[PDB]
Amino acid sequence: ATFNIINNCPFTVWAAAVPGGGKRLDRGQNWIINPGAGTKGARVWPRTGCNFDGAGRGKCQTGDCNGLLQCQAFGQPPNTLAEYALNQFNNLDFFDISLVDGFNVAMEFSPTSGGCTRGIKCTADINGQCPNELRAPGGCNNPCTVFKTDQYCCNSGNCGLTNFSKFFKDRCPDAYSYPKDDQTSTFTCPAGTNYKVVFCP
């Protein structure tokens, strides 16, 4: 599996991936990663508002991963997430866009190879429309992050759509809006598919 991570936003985005690291992308720049077979628990995300020194150490306003350009850890919300697990189940990759850790930048997460043709987008103006309760510098947090209750965070295994997850779900129906939003947010492709993650598609 190859992932082509493309910045189509009219501002610099510091792509991040675990596994993969990170890369500063001006508009139109891309970054190709090649996660190992069977990678799981993986993410790709955009970061905005970054200032890094020449060693790649500093801070991002959104999606910061322990202050590194080359991420080895997940990012600080809010950050729009491309999540994937290669060869997760019955020879299928399972992939999704998640807003469970908020939204910073619009995203497409789609297969590029001919064996899979259905992908995922989240392109609404979530930052502009974000509930004031959820706003954070550079983005729009999920209520689980903000309020940290079972109702939003699903630790008990029960939860559902809430007013604040519905904000996201109405706008990006194909993305996870809350942890257990599986039924309408789980995408699959045959193992061996290649993908793209596009910021501001």
From Swiss-Prot:
Q: Which Gene3D superfamilies match?
A: Thaumatin (2.60.110.10)
Any single biological process term in GO: defense response to fungus
Coiled-coil residues: none
Q: Which domain of life is it from?
A: Eukaryota
By its UniProt entry, which InterPro entries does this protein fall under? Osmotin/thaumatin-like_sf (IPR037176), Thaumatin (IPR001938), Thaumatin_CS (IPR017949)
Localization annotation: Secreted
Tissue pattern of expression reads:
Woody stem plug.
Please describe what this protein does.
Answer: Has antifungal activity.
This chain's protein is named: Thaumatin-like protein
